[PDB]
Coordinates of C-alpha atoms and ligand atoms in Angstrom, one line a residue:
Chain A
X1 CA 58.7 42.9 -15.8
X2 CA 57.4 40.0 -17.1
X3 CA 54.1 40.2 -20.0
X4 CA 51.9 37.8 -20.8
X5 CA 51.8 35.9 -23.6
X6 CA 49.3 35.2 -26.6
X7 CA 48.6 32.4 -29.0
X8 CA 47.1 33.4 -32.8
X9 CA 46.2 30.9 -35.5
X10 CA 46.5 31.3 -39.3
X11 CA 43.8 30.3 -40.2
X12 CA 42.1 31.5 -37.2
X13 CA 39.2 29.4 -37.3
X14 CA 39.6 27.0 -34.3
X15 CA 37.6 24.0 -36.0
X16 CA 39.8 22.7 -39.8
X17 CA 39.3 19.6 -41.9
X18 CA 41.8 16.8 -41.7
X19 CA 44.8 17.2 -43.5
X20 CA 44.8 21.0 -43.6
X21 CA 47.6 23.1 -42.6
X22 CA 48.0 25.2 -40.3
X23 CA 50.2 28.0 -37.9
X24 CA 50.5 28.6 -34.6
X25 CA 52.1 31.9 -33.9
X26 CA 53.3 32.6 -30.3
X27 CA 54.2 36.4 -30.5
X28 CA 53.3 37.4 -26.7
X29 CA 56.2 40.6 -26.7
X30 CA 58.8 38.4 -26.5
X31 CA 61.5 41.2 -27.5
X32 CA 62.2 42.4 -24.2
X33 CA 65.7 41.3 -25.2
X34 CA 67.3 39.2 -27.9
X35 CA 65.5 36.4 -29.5
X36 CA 64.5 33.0 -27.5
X37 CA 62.9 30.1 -28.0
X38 CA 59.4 28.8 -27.2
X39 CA 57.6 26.1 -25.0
X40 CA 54.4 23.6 -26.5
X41 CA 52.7 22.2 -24.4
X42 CA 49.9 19.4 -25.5
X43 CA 47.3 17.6 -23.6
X44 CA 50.0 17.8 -20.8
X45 CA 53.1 16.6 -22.7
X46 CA 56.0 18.9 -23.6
X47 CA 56.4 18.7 -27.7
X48 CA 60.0 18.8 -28.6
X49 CA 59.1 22.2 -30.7
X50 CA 60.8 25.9 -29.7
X51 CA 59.9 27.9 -32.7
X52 CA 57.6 30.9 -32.5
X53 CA 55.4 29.4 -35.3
X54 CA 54.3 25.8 -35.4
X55 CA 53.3 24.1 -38.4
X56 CA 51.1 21.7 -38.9
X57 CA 51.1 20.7 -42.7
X58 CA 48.8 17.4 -42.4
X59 CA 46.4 18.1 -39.9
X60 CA 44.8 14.8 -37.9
X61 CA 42.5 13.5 -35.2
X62 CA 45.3 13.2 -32.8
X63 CA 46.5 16.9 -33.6
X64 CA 43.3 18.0 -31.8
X65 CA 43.2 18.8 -28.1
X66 CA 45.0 21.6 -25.4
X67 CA 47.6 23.6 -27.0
X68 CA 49.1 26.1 -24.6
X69 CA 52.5 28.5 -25.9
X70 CA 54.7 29.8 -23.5
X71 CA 58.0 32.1 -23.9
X72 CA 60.8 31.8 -21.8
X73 CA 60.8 35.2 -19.3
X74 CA 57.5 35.4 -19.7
X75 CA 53.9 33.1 -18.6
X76 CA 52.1 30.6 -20.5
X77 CA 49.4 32.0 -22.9
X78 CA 45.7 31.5 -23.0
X79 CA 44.7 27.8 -24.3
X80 CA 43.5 27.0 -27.4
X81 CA 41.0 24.4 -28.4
X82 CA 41.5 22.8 -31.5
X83 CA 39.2 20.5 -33.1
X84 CA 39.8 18.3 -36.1
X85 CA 36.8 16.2 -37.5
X86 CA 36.3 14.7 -40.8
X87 CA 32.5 15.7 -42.1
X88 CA 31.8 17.0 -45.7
X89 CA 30.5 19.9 -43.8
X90 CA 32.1 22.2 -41.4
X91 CA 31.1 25.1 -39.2
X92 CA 34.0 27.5 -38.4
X93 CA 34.4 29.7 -35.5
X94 CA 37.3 32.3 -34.5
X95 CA 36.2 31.4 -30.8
X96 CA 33.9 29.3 -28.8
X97 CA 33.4 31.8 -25.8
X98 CA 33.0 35.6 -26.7
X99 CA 32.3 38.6 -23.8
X100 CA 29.6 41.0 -24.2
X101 CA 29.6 43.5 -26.8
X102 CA 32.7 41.1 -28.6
X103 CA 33.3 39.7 -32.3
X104 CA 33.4 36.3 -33.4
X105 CA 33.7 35.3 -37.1
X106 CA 32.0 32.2 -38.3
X107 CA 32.4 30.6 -41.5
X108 CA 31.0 27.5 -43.5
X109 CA 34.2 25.3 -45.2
X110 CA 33.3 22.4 -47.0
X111 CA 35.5 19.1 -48.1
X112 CA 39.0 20.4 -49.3
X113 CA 37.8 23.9 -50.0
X114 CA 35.3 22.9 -52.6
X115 CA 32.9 25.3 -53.6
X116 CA 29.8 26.0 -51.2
X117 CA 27.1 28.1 -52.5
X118 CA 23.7 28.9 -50.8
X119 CA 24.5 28.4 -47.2
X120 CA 21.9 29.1 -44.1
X121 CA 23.2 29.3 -40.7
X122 CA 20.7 28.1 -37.9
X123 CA 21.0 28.9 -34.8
X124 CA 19.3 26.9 -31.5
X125 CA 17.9 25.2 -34.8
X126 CA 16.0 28.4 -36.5
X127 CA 18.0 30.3 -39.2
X128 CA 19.1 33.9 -38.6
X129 CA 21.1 34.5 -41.6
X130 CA 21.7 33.6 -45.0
X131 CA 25.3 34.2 -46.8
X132 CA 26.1 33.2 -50.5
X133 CA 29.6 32.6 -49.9
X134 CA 31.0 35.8 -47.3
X135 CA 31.3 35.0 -43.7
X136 CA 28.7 36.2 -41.1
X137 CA 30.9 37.4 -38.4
X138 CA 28.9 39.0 -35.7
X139 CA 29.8 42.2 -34.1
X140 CA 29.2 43.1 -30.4
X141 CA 27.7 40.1 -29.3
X142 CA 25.2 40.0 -26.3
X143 CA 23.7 37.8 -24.6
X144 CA 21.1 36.7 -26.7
X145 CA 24.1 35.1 -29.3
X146 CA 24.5 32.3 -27.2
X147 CA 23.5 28.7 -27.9
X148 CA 24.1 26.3 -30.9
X149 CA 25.0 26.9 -34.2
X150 CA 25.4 24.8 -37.5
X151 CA 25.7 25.9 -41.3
X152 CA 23.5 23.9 -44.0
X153 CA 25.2 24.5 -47.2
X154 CA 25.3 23.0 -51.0
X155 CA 28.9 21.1 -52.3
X156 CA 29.2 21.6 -55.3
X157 CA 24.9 20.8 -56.3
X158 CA 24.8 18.8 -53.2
X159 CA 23.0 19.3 -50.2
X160 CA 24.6 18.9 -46.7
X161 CA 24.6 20.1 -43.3
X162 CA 27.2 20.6 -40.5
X163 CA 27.9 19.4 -37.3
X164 CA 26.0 21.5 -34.6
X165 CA 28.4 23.5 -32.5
X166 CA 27.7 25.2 -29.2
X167 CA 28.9 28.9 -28.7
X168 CA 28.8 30.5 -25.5
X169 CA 28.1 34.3 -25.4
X170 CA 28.5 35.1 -21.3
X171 CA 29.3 38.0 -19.6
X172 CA 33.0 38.0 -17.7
X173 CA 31.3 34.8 -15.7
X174 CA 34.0 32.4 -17.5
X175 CA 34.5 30.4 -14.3
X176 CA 35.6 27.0 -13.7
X177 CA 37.3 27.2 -9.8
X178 CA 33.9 29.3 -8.7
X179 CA 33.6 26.1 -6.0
X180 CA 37.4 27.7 -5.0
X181 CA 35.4 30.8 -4.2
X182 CA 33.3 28.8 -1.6
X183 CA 36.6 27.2 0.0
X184 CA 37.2 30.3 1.8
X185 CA 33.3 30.2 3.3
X186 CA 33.8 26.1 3.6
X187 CA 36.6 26.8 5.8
X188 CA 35.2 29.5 7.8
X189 CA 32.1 27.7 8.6
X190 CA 34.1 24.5 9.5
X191 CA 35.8 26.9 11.9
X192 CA 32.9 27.8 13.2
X193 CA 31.6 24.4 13.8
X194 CA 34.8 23.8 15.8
X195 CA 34.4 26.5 18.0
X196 CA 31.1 25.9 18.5
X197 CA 32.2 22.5 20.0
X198 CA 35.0 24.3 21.7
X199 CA 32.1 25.9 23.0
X200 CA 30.2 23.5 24.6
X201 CA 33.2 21.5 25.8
X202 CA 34.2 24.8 27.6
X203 CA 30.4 25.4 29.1
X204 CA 30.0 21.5 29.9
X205 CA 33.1 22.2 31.8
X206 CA 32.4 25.3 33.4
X207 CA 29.2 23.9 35.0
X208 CA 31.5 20.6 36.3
X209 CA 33.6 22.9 37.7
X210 CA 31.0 25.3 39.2
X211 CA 30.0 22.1 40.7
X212 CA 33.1 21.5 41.9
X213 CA 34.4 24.6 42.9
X214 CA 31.3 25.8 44.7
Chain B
X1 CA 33.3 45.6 -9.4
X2 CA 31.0 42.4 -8.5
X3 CA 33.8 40.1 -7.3
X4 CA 36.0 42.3 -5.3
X5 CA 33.1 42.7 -2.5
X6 CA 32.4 38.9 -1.7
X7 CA 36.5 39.0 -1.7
X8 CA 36.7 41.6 0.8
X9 CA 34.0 40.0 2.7
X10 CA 35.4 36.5 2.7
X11 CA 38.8 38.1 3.8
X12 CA 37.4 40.0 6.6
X13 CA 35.4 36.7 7.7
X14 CA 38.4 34.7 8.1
X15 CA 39.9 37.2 10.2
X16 CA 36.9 37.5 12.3
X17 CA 36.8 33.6 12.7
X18 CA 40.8 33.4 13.4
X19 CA 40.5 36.3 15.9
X20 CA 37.3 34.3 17.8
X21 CA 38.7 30.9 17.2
X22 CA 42.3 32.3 19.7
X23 CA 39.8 33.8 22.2
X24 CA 38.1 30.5 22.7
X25 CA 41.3 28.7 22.7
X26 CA 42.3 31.2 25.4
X27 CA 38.9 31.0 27.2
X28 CA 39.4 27.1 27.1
X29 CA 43.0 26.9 28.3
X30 CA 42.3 29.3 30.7
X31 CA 38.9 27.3 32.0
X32 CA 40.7 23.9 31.8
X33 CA 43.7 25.5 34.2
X34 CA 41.1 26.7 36.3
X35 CA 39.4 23.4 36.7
X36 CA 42.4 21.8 37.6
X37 CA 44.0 24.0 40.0
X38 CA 40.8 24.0 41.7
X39 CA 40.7 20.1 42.0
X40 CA 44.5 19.8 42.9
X41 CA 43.4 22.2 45.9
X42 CA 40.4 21.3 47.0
X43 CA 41.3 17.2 46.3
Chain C
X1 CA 56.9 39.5 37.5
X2 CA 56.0 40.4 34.0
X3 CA 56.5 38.1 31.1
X4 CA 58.1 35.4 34.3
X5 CA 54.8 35.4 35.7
X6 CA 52.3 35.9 32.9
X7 CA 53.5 32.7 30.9
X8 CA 52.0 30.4 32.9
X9 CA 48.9 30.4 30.5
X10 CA 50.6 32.4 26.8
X11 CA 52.9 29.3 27.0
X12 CA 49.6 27.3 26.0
X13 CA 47.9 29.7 24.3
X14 CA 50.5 30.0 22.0
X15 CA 51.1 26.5 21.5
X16 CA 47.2 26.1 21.0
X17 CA 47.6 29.4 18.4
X18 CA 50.7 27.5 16.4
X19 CA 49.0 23.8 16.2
X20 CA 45.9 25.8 14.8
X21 CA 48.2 28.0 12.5
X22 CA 49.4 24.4 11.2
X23 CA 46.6 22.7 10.6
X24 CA 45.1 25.4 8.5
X25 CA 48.3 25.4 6.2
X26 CA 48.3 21.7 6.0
X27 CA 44.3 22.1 5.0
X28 CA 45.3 25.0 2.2
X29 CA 48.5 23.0 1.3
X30 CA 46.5 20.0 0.7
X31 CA 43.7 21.5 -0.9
X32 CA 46.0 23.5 -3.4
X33 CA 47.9 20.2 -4.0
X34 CA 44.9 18.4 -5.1
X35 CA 42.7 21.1 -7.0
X36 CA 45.3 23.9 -8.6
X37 CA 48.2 21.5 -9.5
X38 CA 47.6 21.1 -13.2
X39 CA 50.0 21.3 -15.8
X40 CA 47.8 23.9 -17.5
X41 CA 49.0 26.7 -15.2
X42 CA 52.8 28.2 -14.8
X43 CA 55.0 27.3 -12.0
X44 CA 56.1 31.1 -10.9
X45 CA 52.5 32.1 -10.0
X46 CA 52.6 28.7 -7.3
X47 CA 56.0 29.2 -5.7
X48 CA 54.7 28.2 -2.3
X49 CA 53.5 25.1 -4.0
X50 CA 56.4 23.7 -5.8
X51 CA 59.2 23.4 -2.9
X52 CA 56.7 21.3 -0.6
X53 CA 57.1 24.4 2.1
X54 CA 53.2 24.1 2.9
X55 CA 53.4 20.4 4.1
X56 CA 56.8 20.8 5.5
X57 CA 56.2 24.0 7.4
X58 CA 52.6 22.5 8.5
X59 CA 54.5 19.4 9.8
X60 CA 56.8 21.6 11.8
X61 CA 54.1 23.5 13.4
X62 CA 52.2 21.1 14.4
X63 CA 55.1 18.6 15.9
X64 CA 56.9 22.2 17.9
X65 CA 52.8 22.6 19.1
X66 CA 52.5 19.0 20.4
X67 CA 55.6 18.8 21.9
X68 CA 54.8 22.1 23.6
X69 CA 51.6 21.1 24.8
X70 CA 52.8 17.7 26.4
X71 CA 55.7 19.3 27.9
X72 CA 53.2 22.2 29.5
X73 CA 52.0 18.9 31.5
X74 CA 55.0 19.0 33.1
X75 CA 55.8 15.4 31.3
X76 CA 59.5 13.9 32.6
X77 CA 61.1 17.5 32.7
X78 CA 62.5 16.8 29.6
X79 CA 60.5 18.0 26.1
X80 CA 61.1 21.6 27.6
X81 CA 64.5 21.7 25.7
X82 CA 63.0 19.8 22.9
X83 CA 60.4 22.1 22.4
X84 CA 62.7 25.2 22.5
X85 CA 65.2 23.6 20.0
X86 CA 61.8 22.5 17.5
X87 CA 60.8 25.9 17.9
X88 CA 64.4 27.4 17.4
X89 CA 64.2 25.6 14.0
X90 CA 60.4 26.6 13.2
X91 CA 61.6 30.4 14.0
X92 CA 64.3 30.0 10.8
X93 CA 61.2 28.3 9.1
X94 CA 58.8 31.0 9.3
X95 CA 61.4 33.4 8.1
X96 CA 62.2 31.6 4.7
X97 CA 58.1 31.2 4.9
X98 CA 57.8 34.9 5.2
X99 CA 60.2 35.2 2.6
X100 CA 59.0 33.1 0.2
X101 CA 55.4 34.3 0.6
X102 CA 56.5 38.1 -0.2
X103 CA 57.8 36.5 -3.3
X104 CA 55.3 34.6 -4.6
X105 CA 53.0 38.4 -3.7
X106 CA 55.1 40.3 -5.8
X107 CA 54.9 37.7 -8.7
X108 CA 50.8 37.6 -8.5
X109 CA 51.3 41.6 -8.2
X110 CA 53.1 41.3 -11.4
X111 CA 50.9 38.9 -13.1
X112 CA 47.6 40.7 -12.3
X113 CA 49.4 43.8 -13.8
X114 CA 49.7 42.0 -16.6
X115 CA 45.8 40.9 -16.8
X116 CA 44.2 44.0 -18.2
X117 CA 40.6 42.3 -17.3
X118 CA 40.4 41.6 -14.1
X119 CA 39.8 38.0 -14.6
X120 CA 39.2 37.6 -18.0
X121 CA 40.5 34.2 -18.3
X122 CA 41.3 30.9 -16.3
X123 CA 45.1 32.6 -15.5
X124 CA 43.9 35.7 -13.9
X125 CA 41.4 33.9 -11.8
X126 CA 43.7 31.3 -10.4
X127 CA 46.4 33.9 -9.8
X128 CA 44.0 35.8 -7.5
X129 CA 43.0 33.0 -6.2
X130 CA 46.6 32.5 -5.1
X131 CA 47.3 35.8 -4.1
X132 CA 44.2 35.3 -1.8
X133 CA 45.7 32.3 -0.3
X134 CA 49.2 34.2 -0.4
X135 CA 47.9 36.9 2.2
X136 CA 45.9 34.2 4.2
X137 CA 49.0 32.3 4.6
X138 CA 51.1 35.8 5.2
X139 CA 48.9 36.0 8.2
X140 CA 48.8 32.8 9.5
X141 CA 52.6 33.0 9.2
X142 CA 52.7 36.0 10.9
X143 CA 50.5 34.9 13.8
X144 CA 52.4 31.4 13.8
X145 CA 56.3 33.5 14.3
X146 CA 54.9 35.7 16.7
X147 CA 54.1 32.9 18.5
X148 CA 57.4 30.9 17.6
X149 CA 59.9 33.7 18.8
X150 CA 57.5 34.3 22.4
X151 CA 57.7 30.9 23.1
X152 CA 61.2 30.9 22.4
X153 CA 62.3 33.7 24.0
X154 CA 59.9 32.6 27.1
X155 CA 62.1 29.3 27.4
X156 CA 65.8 31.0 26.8
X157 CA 64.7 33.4 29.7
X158 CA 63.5 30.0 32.0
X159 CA 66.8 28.1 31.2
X160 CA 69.2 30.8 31.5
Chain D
X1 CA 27.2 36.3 -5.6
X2 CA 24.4 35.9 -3.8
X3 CA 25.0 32.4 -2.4
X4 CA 28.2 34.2 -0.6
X5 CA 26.5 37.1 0.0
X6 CA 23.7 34.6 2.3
X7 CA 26.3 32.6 3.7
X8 CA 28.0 35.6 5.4
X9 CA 24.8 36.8 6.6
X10 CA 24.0 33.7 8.3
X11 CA 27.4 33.6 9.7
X12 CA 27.3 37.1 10.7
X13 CA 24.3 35.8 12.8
X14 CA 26.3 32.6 14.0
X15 CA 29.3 34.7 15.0
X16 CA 27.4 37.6 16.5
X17 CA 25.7 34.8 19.0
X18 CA 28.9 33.2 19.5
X19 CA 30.1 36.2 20.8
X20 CA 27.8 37.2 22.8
X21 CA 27.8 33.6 24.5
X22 CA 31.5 33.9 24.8
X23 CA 31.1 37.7 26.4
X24 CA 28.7 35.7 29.0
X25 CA 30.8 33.3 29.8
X26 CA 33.6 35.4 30.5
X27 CA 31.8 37.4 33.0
X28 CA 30.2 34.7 34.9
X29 CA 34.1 33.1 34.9
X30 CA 35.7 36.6 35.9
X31 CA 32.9 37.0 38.7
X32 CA 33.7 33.2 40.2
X33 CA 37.2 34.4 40.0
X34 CA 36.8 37.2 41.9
X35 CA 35.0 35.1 44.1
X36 CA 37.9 33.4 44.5
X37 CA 39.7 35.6 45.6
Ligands
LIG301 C1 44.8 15.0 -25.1 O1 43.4 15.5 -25.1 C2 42.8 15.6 -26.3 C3 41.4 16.2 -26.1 O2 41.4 17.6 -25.8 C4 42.8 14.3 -27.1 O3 42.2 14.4 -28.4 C5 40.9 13.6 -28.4 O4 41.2 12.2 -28.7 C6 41.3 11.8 -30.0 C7 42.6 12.2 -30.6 O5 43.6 11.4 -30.2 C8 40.0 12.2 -30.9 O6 39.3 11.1 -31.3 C9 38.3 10.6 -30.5 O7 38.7 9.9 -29.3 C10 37.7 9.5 -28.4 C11 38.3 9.0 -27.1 O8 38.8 10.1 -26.4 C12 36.8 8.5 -29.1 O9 35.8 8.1 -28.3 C13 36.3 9.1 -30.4 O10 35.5 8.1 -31.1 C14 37.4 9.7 -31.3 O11 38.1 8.6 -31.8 C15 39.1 13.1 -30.0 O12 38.2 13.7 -30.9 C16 40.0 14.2 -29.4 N1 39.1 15.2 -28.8 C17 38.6 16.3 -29.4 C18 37.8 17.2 -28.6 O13 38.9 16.5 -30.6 C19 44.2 13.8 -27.2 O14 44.2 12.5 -27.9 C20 44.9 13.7 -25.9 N2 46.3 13.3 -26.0 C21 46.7 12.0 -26.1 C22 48.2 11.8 -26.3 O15 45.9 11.1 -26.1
LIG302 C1 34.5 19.1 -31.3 O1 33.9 18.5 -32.5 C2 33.1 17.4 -32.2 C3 32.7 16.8 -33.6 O2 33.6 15.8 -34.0 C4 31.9 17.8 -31.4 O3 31.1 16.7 -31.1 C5 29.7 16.9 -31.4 O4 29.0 17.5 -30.3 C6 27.6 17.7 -30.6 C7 27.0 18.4 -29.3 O5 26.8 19.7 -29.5 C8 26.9 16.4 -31.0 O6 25.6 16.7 -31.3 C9 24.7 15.9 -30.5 O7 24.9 14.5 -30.8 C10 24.1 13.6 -30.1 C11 24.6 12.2 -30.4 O8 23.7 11.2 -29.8 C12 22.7 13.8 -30.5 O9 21.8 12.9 -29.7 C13 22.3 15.3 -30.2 O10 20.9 15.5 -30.6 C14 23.2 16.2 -30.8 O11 23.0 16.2 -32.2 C15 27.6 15.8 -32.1 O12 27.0 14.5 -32.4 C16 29.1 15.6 -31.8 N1 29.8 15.1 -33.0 C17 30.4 13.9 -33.0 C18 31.1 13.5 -34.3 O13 30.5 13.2 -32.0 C19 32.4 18.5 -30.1 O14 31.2 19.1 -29.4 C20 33.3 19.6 -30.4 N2 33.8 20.3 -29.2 C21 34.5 19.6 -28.3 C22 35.0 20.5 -27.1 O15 34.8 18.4 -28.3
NAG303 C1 65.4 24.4 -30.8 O1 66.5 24.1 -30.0 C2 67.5 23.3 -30.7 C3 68.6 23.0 -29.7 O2 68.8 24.1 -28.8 C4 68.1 24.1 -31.9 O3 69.0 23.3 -32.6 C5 66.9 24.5 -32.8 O4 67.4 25.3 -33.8 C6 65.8 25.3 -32.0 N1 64.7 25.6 -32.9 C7 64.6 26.7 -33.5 C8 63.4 26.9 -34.4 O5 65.5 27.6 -33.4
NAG304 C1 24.0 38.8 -42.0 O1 25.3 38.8 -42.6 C2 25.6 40.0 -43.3 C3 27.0 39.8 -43.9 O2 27.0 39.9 -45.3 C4 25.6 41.2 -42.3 O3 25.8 42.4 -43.0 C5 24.2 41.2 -41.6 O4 24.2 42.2 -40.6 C6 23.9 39.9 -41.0 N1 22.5 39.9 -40.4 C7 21.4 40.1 -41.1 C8 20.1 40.1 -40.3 O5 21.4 40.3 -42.3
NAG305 C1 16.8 36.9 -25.9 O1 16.0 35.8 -26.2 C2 14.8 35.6 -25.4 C3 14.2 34.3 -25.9 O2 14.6 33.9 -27.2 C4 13.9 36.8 -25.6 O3 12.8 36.7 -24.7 C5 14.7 38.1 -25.2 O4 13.9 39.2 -25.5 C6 16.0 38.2 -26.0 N1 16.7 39.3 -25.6 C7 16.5 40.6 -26.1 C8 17.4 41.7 -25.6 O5 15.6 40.8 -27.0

C-alpha cells in the first residue's frame, strides 16, 4: 500500500538569510521497490527537479514560498513554508505551528553567521529567556507558548533586533476547511427550507382541493 | 474523539433529511394526482 | 396487478427521487470544484473529481428525471421510449459511478491508514472530508440506480 | 463543536415538527380517501 510522504530540511530552521544554502530531503519510505524519482512542486508550478535532495546553494527572495515533495507510488508530503528575508537579524524556528506537549527549536542567526553574543528572546514583547550563544528549544509546548516571538541580540558589539515572528502553539485545531464542516449542515438546512415549501405548497393545495372535492 | 460525533451526527442528519425530503415528494405527487383526478371527474 | 398497477404513482416518485439525487450531485460536484480543487492536494484522493463524472452524471439525472416527468403528462406519446433509452444509459452510468466511488473509498481508506493522527494536518482533513462526500454520494447513487433500473424495468414491462 | 452541536438541535426541533405536520396531513388525506371511497 501506498505511505505517505515527508519533507526534512538541513538546516531545519524554516526562516535563512539570503544567499545561504540549503537541502530539501524528500525521504517519505520511498523503497518499497527500486529507486524513483521525485516531484517539486512550487507556489503551484512543477520545478523541472526529480532528485530526492534539492539544493539551493544561493538562497533568494523568489526561493521563498510553498514547497510541497511528492514520490512517485506514494502522496504528496506535508508543505513547507520557507521564508527568505534580508535583516541583520534573524529569528529561527524548526516550525511555525507545534501540537500540545510538542518541540520546536528556535535559534538567533545573524548576518552571514557572524558572531552573536548576549541574545534575549521576547515573547508577546516580554523576555522569557536569555541564551549566550545555545539555542532555546522548548520542550512540550502548551498552550501558553503561543504568540510572537523575536530575538534581540549583539553582532559583533552591535546592538540589533529581529523581525517579530508569530508562532502558533494550538491543540490538533489546525483547520482551514472548518466552513467544509458546516457544508453538510448548509445543505441540510437548505433541504429543509425546501420541504418546508414543499410543505405549504402541498397544504395550500390540500385545502383547494378539499374545497373542491367536498 | 471530539470530531467523529458532529460527523456521525451530520451523517445521520442527511439521511434523516433525504429520507423526509422522498416522503414529501411522495406526499406531493400523491396530493397533486389526487387533485387532478378529482377535477377531471367532477369537471 | 402488482407492479402493472402500483406504478401509476412510483413512476413519479421515482423520477421526483432521481432529479433530487441529481441536483444534490451537481451542488457537491460544484462545490468540490470550486473549494477543494487546488494544486496543493493529490489527484488519487479526488478520483470522482478529476474525470468530470459529478457534472456529467448530475446532467444525466436530471435530463432522464425531466424527460420522465413530462412524459408522466402523457405529452405526444412519445418521450416514453426516450425516457427508457435515457435511463437505459443512466443505468450503465450509475454502475461506472458505483464503481468509481468504491474506488476512490478504498484509496481514502488507504490514505487515512496512512495518517497516524487523525487529522493532523491539511491532507488528513480533506481526505475525510472526501471520504464523507464519498459515502454521501455512494448513497445518493444507490438511491438514484434503484430508481434507474425500476423505472426501467417498469417501461420494458409496458412496451413488451 | 458547539455551533454544530446547536444547529442539530434546532433542526432536530425543525424536523420533529415537520414530521409531525406531515403524520397529520397524511391522516386527514387517508381519511378523505376513504371518504372516497
Ligand atoms: C508563490 O508564492 C510565494 C509566497 O508563498 C511567493 O513568494 C513571495 O513573493 C516574493 C518572492 O517572489 C517575496 O517578495 C515580496 O513580494 C511581495 C509581493 O507578493 C512584495 O509586496 C514585497 O515587498 C516583497 O517584494 C515575498 O516575500 C514572498 N513571500 C514570502 C512569504 O516570503 C512567490 O513569488 C510565488 N511564486 C511566483 C512565481 O511568484
Ligand atoms: C515571513 O517573513 C516576513 C519578514 O520579511 C514576515 O513579515 C513580517 O510580519 C510581521 C507581522 O508579525 C510584521 O510586523 C508588523 O509590521 C507592521 C508594519 O506596519 C507593524 O505595524 C506591526 O507593529 C508589526 O511590527 C513585519 O513588519 C513583517 N516584516 C516585513 C519585512 O514586512 C512574515 O510574517 C513571515 N511569514 C509569512 C507567512 O510571510
Ligand atoms: C531526472 O530525470 C532525467 C530524465 O529522466 C534524468 O536524466 C535525470 O538524471 C533525473 N535526475 C536525477 C537526479 O536522477
Ligand atoms: C532557557 O534555555 C535553557 C537552554 O540553555 C533551558 O535549559 C531553560 O529551561 C530555558 N528556560 C529557562 C526559564 O531558563
Ligand atoms: C497562560 O497565560 C495566561 C495569561 O498570560 C495566564 O492567565 C494563564 O495562567 C497561563 N496558563 C497557565 C497554565 O498558567
Amino acid at each position: 500500500a501506498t505511505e505517505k510522504s515527508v519533507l526534512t530540511l538541513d538546516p531545519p530552521w524554516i526562516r535563512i538569510f539570503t544567499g545561504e544554502k540549503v537541502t530539501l530531503s524528500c525521504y517519505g519510505n520511498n523503497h518499497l521497490q527500486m529507486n524513483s524519482t521525485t516531484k517539486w512542486i512550487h507556489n503551484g508550478t512543477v520545478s523541472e527537479v526529480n532528485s530526492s535532495h534539492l539544493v539551493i546553494v544561493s538562497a533568494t527572495v523568489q526561493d521563498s514560498g510553498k514547497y510541497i515533495c511528492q514520490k512517485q507510488g506514494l502522496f504528496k508530503s506535508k508543505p513547507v513554508y520557507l521564508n527568505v528575508t534580508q535583516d541583520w537579524l534573524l529569528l529561527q524556528t524548526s516550525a511555525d505551528m507545534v501540537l500540545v506537549h510538542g518541540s520546536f527549536d528556535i535559534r538567533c542567526h545573524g548576518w552571514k553567521n557572524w558572531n552573536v553574543r548576549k541574545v534575549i528572546y521576547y515573547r508577546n514583547d516580554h523576555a522569557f529567556n536569555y541564551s549566550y550563544e545555545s539555542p532555546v528549544s522548548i520542550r512540550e509546548a502548551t498552550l501558553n507558548d503561543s504568540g510572537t516571538y523575536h530575538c534581540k541580540g549583539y553582532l559583533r558589539q552591535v546592538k540589533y533586533e529581529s523581525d517579530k515572528f508569530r508562532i502558533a502553539v494550538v491543540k490538533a485545531y489546525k483547520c482551514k476547511y472548518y466552513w467544509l464542516q458546516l457544508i453538510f449542515p448548509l445543505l441540510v438546512a437548505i433541504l429543509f427550507a425546501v420541504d418546508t415549501g414543499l410543505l405549504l405548497s402541498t397544504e395550500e393545495q390540500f385545502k383547494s382541493v378539499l374545497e373542491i372535492q367536498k | 474523539g471530539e470530531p467523529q460525533l458532529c460527523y456521525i451526527l451530520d451523517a445521520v442528519l442527511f439521511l434523516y433529511g433525504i429520507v423526509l425530503t422522498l416522503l414529501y415528494c411522495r406526499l406531493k405527487i400523491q396530493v397533486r394526482k389526487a387533485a387532478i383526478a378529482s377535477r377531471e371527474k367532477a369537471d | 396487478q402488482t407492479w402493472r398497477t402500483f406504478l401509476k404513482k412510483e413512476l413519479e416518485f421515482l423520477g421526483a427521487t432521481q432529479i433530487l439525487v441529481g441536483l444534490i450531485c451537481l451542488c457537491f460536484g460544484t462545490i468540490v470544484c470550486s473549494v477543494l480543487y487546488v494544486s496543493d492536494f493529490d489527484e488519487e484522493v479526488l478520483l470522482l473529481y478529476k474525470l468530470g463524472y459529478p457534472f456529467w452524471g448530475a446532467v444525466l439525472f436530471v435530463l432522464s428525471g425531466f424527460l420522465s416527468i413530462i412524459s408522466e403528462r402523457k405529452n405526444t406519446l412519445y418521450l416514453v421510449r426516450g425516457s427508457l433509452g435515457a435511463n437505459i444509459v443512466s443505468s450503465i452510468a450509475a454502475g461506472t459511478g458505483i464503481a468509481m466511488l468504491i474506488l476512490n473509498l478504498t484509496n481514502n481508506f488507504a490514505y487515512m491508514n496512512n495518517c497516524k493522527n487523525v487529522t493532523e494536518d491539511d491532507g488528513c482533513f480533506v481526505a475525510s472530508f472526501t471520504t464523507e462526500l464519498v459515502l454521501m454520494m455512494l448513497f445518493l447513487t444507490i438511491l438514484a440506480f434503484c430508481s434507474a433500473v425500476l423505472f426501467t424495468i417498469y417501461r420494458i414491462g409496458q412496451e413488451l
